[PDB]
Amino acid sequence: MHLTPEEKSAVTALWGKVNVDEVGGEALGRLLVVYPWTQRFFESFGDLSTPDAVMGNPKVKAHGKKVLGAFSDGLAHLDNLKGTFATLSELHCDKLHVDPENFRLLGKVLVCVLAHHFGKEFTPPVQAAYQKVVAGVANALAHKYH
Amino acid sequence: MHLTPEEKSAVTALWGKVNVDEVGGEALGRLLVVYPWTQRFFESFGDLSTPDAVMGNPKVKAHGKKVLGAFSDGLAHLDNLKGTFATLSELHCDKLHVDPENFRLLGKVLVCVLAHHFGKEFTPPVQAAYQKVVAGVANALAHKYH
Amino acid sequence: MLSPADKTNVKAAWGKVGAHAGEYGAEALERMFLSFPTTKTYFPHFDLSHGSAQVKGHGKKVADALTNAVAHVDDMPNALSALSDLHAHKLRVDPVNFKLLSHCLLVTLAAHLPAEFTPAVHASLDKFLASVSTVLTSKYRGVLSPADKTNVKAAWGKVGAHAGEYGAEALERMFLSFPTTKTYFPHFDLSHGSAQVKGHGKKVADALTNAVAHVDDMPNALSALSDLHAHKLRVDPVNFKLLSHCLLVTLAAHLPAEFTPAVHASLDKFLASVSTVLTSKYR
Numbered sequence: 412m413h414l415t416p417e418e419k420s421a422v423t424a425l426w427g428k429v430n431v432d433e434v435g436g437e438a439l440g441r442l443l444v445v446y447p448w449t450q451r452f453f454e455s456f457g458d459l460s461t462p463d464a465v466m467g468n469p470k471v472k473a474h475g476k477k478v479l480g481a482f483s484d485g486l487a488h489l490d491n492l493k494g495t496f497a498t499l500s501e502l503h504c505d506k507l508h509v510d511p512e513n514f515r516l517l518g519k520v521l522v523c524v525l526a527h528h529f530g531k532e533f534t535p536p537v538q539a540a541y542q543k544v545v546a547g548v549a550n551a552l553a554h555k556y557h
Numbered sequence: 558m559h560l561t562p563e564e565k566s567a568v569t570a571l572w573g574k575v576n577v578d579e580v581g582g583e584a585l586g587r588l589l590v591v592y593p594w595t596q597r598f599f600e601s602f603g604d605l606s607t608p609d610a611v612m613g614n615p616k617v618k619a620h621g622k623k624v625l626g627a628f629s630d631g632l633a634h635l636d637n638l639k640g641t642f643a644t645l646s647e648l649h650c651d652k653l654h655v656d657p658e659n660f661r662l663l664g665k666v667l668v669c670v671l672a673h674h675f676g677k678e679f680t681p682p683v684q685a686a687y688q689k690v691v692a693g694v695a696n697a698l699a700h701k702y703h
Numbered sequence: 704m705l706s707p708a709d710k711t712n713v714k715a716a717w718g719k720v721g722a723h724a725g726e727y728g729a730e731a732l733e734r735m736f737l738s739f740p741t742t743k744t745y746f747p748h749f750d751l752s753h754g755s756a757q758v759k760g761h762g763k764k765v766a767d768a769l770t771n772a773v774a775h776v777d778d779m780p781n782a783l784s785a786l787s788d789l790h791a792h793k794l795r796v797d798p799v800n801f802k803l804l805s806h807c808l809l810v811t812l813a814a815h816l817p818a819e820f821t822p823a824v825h826a827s828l829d830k831f832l833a834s835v836s837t838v839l840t841s842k843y844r845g846v847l848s849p850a851d852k853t854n855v856k857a858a859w860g861k862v863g864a865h866a867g868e869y870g871a872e873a874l875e876r877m878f879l880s881f882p883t884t885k886t887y888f889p890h891f892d893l894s895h896g897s898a899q900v901k902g903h904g905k906k907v908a909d910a911l912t913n914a915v916a917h918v919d920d921m922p923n924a925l926s927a928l929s930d931l932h933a934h935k936l937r938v939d940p941v942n943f944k945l946l947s948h949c950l951l952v953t954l955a956a957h958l959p960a961e962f963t964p965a966v967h968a969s970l971d972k973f974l975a976s977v978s979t980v981l982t983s984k985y986r
C-alpha cells in the first residue's frame with residue numbers, strides 16, 4: 412500500500428485514540444443492522460431480531476473485537492497488506508465462504524463509525540487516507556480468492 | 558498482469574481472428590446504444606438518436622477503430638499494462654475528463670460482442686480469460702487519474 | 704422500501720441538520736472529491752479549491768433538493784422529476800457515482816450529529832439516500848417500453864426449450880469469470896457438466912420464463928423468490944449484475960441473428976429490472 416508519509420501519520424495518529432474493542436463491536440453491529448443480509452454468517456450468534464439486540468449481542472461484540480484486532484495489527488504493515496493477510500484471505504474463501512463484497516461493506520461502515528466517534532477531528536483529508544486503507548485491506552483479503 | 562498459460566493462449570488465439578475495424582465499431586456503437594449516458598463525450602459526432610443512427614454513424618466507426626486499435630496494441634504487452642497505457646491514462650483524465658467507469662462498461666460490451674461474433678467458440682473458459690484482460694486494461698487506463 | 708419508521712428517522716435527523724444543510728452539502732462534496740478523485744471528472748468547469756463559491760453554491764443546491772425530498776418522502780419521483788430529467792438527459796453522470804456521494808453525505812452527517820446518528824437512524828438514512836439515487840437515475844433508460852417488452856418476448860421465444868441449457872451455461876460462465884460467486888454454492892459440485900449446476904440453471908431459466916410471461920406484474924410473480932433471496936439465501940446484491948451479464952453473453956453466443964443492438968439494450972434493461980425486484984425486500 413503506497414500512502415504518502417502524511418497519510419500514514421494521519422491514519423496512525425487517529426488509530427492511537429481508538430478503543431479497538433468498542434469500535435470493533437460498534438462496526439460489526441452496525442454492519443449487521445444497516446446491511447442485514449450480512450447476518451447470513453452469524454446465525455449461531457443468537458438473537459439478532461432488533462438493532463438493540465444486535466448491538467447488545469455479546470457474540471457480535473466478541474467477533475467485532477476479533478475482526479478489528481486483526482485490522483489493527485494490519486495497520487502496522489501498510490507497505491505489505493497482501494502478505495500480512497494472505498492466510499486470512501485463503502481462510503475466508505476456502506473455509507468460511509465469505510463474499511469479498513462484505514469486506515467492502517464493513518469498510519464503509521467503519522469509516523462512518525470513525526466519523527461518528529471523532530466528529531470534526533475526522534476531516535476530509537483524514538477520511539481520504541482511511542478510504543485508501545479500508546480499500547487496501549479489502550483488496551488484500553480478497554486476493555487469494557479462486 | 559499474470560495470466561495462466563491456458564488463458565494467454567486463448568486470448569491471443571481468438572484475437573488473431575478479430576477484425577479490429579469491424580469489432581471496434583460494433584463495440585463502441587453498442588456502448589452508446591445500451592448505456593446512452595456515455596453519449597455525453599461524443600456530442601460532436603452528429604446524430605446518435607436511434608440505434609440505427611448510432612451504428613451507421615461514420616465517426617462512431619472511426620473512433621471505435623482507433624480505440625480497439627489501441628486495445629490491440631495492449632494485448633502485445635500483457636505483462637505491463639500500466640506502463641503501456643500510462644500516456645493514454647493521463648490524456649483521458651487531464652484532457653478528456655472521462656470517468657473511468659466508462660472503461661468497465663466498454664469492457665462488458667466488448668465481451669458481449671465477441672460472444673455474438675464468435676458464437677460457440679467463445680467458450681466459458683475463453684470468456685473468463687477475456688474478463689481478466691478487459692479488467693486489466695480498464696485498471697491500467699484508470700491508473701493515472703488524480 | 705422506506706417504511707414509515709424510516710421516514711420518521713430521516714425527518715428527525717434532517718430537522719436537526721436544519722439551517723446547516725448547505726454547509727454540510729459543501730462538506731460532503733469536498734469529502735467526495737478528495738476520497739474519490741474520479742468524481743472530479745464531472746466538474747472540470749469548477750474551481751474545486753477548498754471554500755470556493757462554486758462548491759458552496761452547489762452544496763446548497765444539493766442540500767435544498769434533499770430537503771425537498773425529505774418533505775415529499777411519499778412522492779419522491781414526483782418531487783424530483785425535474786432533477787431526474789436533468790441528470791438523465793443533460794448531465795449524464797454514471798450511476799455508480801451516486802453511491803459515492805451518498806456515502807460522503809452519510810459520513811458528513813455522522814461527524815455532525817453525534818447524538819442522533821444511532822444504528823437505526825444510520826440504517827434509515829442509508830436507505831433514504833439509496834432511494835433518492837434510484838429516483839435520480841430512473842430516467843437514464845426508464846421503464847420497460849412496449850418496444851422493450853416486444854424485443855424481450857421475441858428473443859426469449861427463440862430461446863424456447865433451450866432455456867434450461869442456457870441457464871446452466873450462464874452459471875458456468877459466471878463461476879469461471881467471477882470466482883467470488885462460488886462462495887454461495889459450497890454445497891455444489893461446480894465442475895463442468897455437473898448435474899447440480901444443470902438442475903439449478905433450469906430453475907433460474909424457468910423463473911426468467913415466468914418473469915417474461917408476467918413482465919407487467921413482475922413483483923408479484925417473483926414474490927416468493929424475492930423473499931427467498933432476501934431472507935434466506937441473502938446473496939449480496941452486487942452479484943445479480945454478474946449473472947445478468949453472463950446471461951447476456953450466453954444469449955449473444957446462441958442468438959447470432961436476434962441479438963441486435965436494440966434487443967441487447969432491451970434485454971439489459973429487462974435483467975436489471977428482474978435484479979431490482981429480486982433485491983427489493985433486502986432492507
Ligand code: HEM
Nearest residue numbers: 449452477478479481482499503507509513514517548552
Ligand atoms: C477487515 C475485515 C476482516 C478481518 C480483518 C477479519 C478477520 C478475521 C479473523 C482474525 C478471524 C479468525 C480466524 C481464525 O479463527 O483463525 C475471522 C473469522 C471469521 N470472519 Fe472475518 N474478518 C473480516 C471481515 C469479515 C466479514 C465482513 C465477515 C462476514 C460478514 C467475516 C466473517 C467471519 C467469520 C464467519 C469468521 C469465523 C468466526 C468463528 O469461527 O467464530 N469476516 N475473521
Ligand code: HEM
Nearest residue numbers: 595598599623624625627628645648653655659660663698
Ligand atoms: C478500451 C478503452 C479505451 C482505449 C484503449 C481508448 C483509446 C483512445 C485513443 C487511442 C484515443 C486517441 C487520443 C489522441 O488522439 O491522442 C482516444 C480518444 C478519445 N476517447 Fe478513449 N479509449 C478507450 C475508452 C474510451 C471510452 C469508454 C470513452 C468514453 C465513453 C472514451 C472517450 C474518448 C474521447 C472523447 C476521445 C477523443 C476523441 C476526439 O478527438 O474527439 N474512450 N481514446
Ligand code: HEM
Nearest residue numbers: 742745746764765768769786794796800801804805835836
Ligand atoms: C444525492 C445526489 C444528488 C443530488 C440530490 C443532486 C442534485 C443536483 C442539483 C439540485 C443540481 C443543480 C440543478 C440546477 O442548478 O439546475 C445538480 C447539478 C449537477 N450535478 Fe447533481 N446531484 C446529485 C448527485 C450528483 C453526482 C453523484 C454527481 C457527479 C459526481 C453530480 C453532478 C452534477 C453536475 C456536474 C451538476 C451541474 C453543476 C453546474 O454546472 O452548475 N450530481 N445536482
Ligand code: HEM
Nearest residue numbers: 884887888903906907910911928936938942943946947977
Ligand atoms: C437472474 C437472477 C436470479 C434468479 C432468477 C434466481 C432464481 C432462483 C431460483 C428459481 C432458485 C430456486 C428456488 C427453489 O428452491 O425453488 C434459486 C436459488 C438459489 N439462488 Fe438465486 N436467482 C438469481 C440470482 C442468483 C445469484 C446472483 C446468486 C448467487 C451468485 C444466487 C444464488 C442462489 C442460491 C445459493 C440458491 C440455492 C441453491 C440450492 O441450494 O439449490 N441466485 N435462485
